[model samples]
Target chain A: ADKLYKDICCVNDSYRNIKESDSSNRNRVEQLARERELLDKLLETRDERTRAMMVTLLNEKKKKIRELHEILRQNNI
Target chain B: SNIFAGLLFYVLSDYVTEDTGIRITRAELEKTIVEHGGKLIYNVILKRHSIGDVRLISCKTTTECKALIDRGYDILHPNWVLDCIAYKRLILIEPNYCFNVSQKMRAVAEKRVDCLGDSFENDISETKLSSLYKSQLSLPPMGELEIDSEVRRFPLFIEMKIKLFGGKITDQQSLCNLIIIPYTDPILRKDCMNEVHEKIKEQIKASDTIPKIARVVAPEWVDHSINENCQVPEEDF
Candidate 1:
């Protein structure tokens, strides 16, 4: 059930905007990134283990956004 | 999304009831109009007071949209449109989805639907909504709605639903205020209650949100709560 909620969250993220990997989202992601290295430091922290966890958190948001996008696609809205 | 309208109307009915000290169910929204009389019991506010018609009601192709424009109308959607500006663009009156008769209170529903035009005055169609606040409410463009307008959230749920807040309006005399009314929790939360009408009025007289509605201070006012904001400008199409 928690996973379901997480996935739902991911869906919201995907619909919310382009990802860090998406160039279209680059300027925007950067704008939100604040300082040049702040966001990267959080997700890619100096430690490898921390980076992995960050990936997990980031992916969850990405997934929620995707889910929402699929819904929009389904409805052609 | 099939149930979107029902869900939206459900919240609207509840909010209107809660605001006006009148209790009603989603299915009985139309019925209440019949039972107590619409103009007598409530008023309807839509996105705009412009009268309109479903321009392309049954076309199998997109070609009709162009025809509508040539004839002085605009395609509201792929299969829908407004015949002309002369038509009162009904802010309320139609739903994104089709509606059916319910066995319960079927007669009252029919009667209420019948009385829809008592004060509608213009020819607009589509969408639905609140009372108490209804009296003071004016239909602002969907762009002013605080919620996501680009998202076709036809059936609204609890929390963060789209609505007008307050400010200078286009075509409309009184601008509107946008708000999100969550659907799941108590519809009548003490937090989002009617006691705030005067405060809402005060906010309109003062706050940034109100200025946002006015379109004077908030140039992006049209960007609020609508999806087509991202669409190309009218001339581009």
Candidate 2:
């Protein structure tokens, strides 16, 4: 029984056939590559607005920031 | 007198700590082997030596060195012996001792388990900026990472042989194996983030015939494995 167990569990050939296909590994690599590419693209356009309402909000925020800067400059603080 | 009394070790590299950059060349190692009263096996057929019960091979790694394992040799990463002699004791043969890590690696095949606390996850969610970074960049969280100082600040090379303890850090390739980026000090965070991406890309590009999925894990995973004497779970990047 011990010999049989060793043959079934410890032998190299016993489990070699059960190894997963390499395709999944390759597919994962491809997925990671695409994700990285997509991340770079998203980062490139991150500050841009896709909607009119979003653009108005962003522009108003930018104006407020500029106004604050001007006020600080005038006070030389 | 000699600590390594009656032990036979075959030094099989240009320098025993070549990868780690300690200049104890093969010649120096042979001399040390003799000095320590250990039998320095040289030039014998490595394959044939299996029949001779040749145990304990010390090398960074090679295809040939890996095969010597089941033949009864403990294929230790070169530092094991060098560190042993330096400390005057045989160090533990940890999981990282073997180079390729084929056996235990397969033992946990297709499964990624990161040994980290749930509080680590809670803290990340609490930090608003970190949460934003995670959503935007798809970066991994802490816990399943090697953030501690010892693994981080360890130098990558030794100056002289006497500078052994202060020798190089783990191999860059091994560092690449883990998801090493940490959300710690801003400087450390930025630097590791850059380094980690480059390593991931390099491993992906360098995969020859067998495409390997990158497992981003902490150094503690290996340490945990060493402690348990079994392959611990790892987190996939």
Candidate 3:
């Protein structure tokens, strides 16, 4: 259950970065990176161990990852 | 990505022709509005009593927003407008985008399906509260709210499930009484709610029979309803 929550958070962050990156040129790269990292983390859980650990290790960080994911998912992404 | 592009194209097609008189608080934001092809009316110059078209107050606590709300103006923070220009579509009306709205309210805005938090209260105006009450009375009834999949799993949700809605909580989307989009950060969640609203509308139109009038409200609408022990206003939803 908790794992599902984390996935939602991660996906929502991707939507956020996509919006922000599209908004301003200065923010383009970093926001894209943030989304990529979070998406990598979500996909990595399939088989890749410790691959996306650098993105969010603590439960606190994981908690936020899925929050963003849920938001983006609503956007039909 | 397809949705985002679609919204942008929508704006350029429809919004550009019908320019609305927007009141801007800071001179700095004028450049953004102009660059995006918005017709800006300087607050100080016109000096009108009403907000006129849209109240683009960036900060949360300005006498302007207070008066605007009191007068029933369509109040929105600067980021709300900027994002519309940036993404070319209407975004979520998450109160989090508006400045000075309470923190717990923002937390409620972030609530996902079945993700209930500790009980909390937000500082709302008497006027806003009264309006909320009015909307609550319009709902079907107490104990008739159908907890959606997003919130059905919470202990609080299950405990209150009997009174949450009128029917079974299934995978069905249109039948759900409340649609609480998951909370993203201020950046994404700010403009994302519009997409959800659009999808629901499309579904309702395409179906042979009309579904229930599913209220597309914020998570705070539930939080506010649960906190106040009354039904929430559909207007607020």
Candidate 4:
């Protein structure tokens, strides 16, 4: 009984960790995608300073997306 | 060693049916009990056994349970076994788990309640009392508000309401047991809506934790609970 109890506890801890990370990462990915869409819309307005700002923000969002995608892949989501 | 080592469980065939939400088969349950180093006796011959730890039953107004209780047996719902296995520990048998309420059992239940040192009155209905027992045994509903830009209600007010109902307000998304999405005003329902909230709900539904670790619900869950003066079922929202 002791061994089985320990084994079940270990499995539960790992399962909780995996689920937490998976859901949080997916939420981040969704938020980033929405931000990227807004950035795309902002980029259409032809103003040099605003375009440069939007372009920089868009690049950062794309980088974050790539990093999150890599993480999601590693998690086998 | 298994957690059920040295424990003797007498399982009634009546409690072996499906609809336990975990889909426990009789063969599977018997095998599990044996595997955990526990003795499983299907034929509940009360005369042969002078001592037994637990008697699993579906529960009714039958004298069988009362008889079992008279012989120093803990007459418990079958879910007690499943919960013990699921939690990997012997969950304290609450009044909700017991098939029949003997005088001794009622005293033990009161002792447990007093042990918590809570001064709350015990004048609640049977249904409410059952839920209270369940809430004490399991996790209390912990919720996180989305608090997006489009929400019409004040976030602080909503948090206060959640706290009022003995529910916890969590800031961490992953730690939250449920997410409360604030409803938009009906006046602007057609034109304005929180896109971020919609996406969050979508991701929650698509995520692996949906219907298990985390639930997505509207703020009406809290309001309805307050209106009814009890925690309403979140499944409706």
Model 3 chain A worst lDDT window (10 residues)? A47-56
lDDT of 3 by residue, B68-177 (tens): 44554333454445545553344544443333335544555444211222111231355533443333211221232322222232112122332233122223334354
Each model's Cα RMSD: 29.1, 31.8, 28.1, 29.0
lDDT of 3 at B130: 46
Which runs in model 3 stand beyond 4 Å of their true positions? A1-77, B1-27, B39-61, B70-74, B85-90, B94-108, B112-237
| Collision pairs in model 2 | B113-B234, B155-B169, B156-B168, B157-B168, B179-B216
lDDT for each residue of candidate 1 in A1-77, tens digit (9 for 90 to 100):
67776677777577656544575667667676576467546432333332233343334345555867888885786
Q: Put down candidate 3 lDDT per residue, A1-77, tens digits, no spaces.
A: 67776787777787777666675655656776677668756643422222122122233244666877888785877
Error of 2 at A59 (Å): 48
- Against the native complex, each candidate's DockQ, computed on alpha carbons, is 0.02, 0.01, 0.01, 0.01
CAPRI-style docking class of model 2 based on DockQ: incorrect
Candidate models: Cα lDDT each: 0.32, 0.41, 0.41, 0.44
Question: Model 4 chain B: which ten-residue window has the lowest total lDDT?
Answer: B148-157
- Predict model 1's lDDT versus the native: 0.32
Per-residue CA lDDT of model 2 for B155-181, tens digit only, reads 111122112122213334353333433
Give TM-scores for every candidate, taking all chains together and pairing residue i with residue i.
0.13, 0.23, 0.22, 0.24
Candidate 2 lDDT (Cα, 0 to 1): 0.41
Q: What is the Cα-based TM-score of model 1?
A: 0.13
Q: Chain B TM-score per candidate, please.
A: 0.14, 0.27, 0.24, 0.28
Instruction: Give lDDT tens digits, candidate 4, residues B148-192.
Output: 221122222125343432332224434344555555565333222
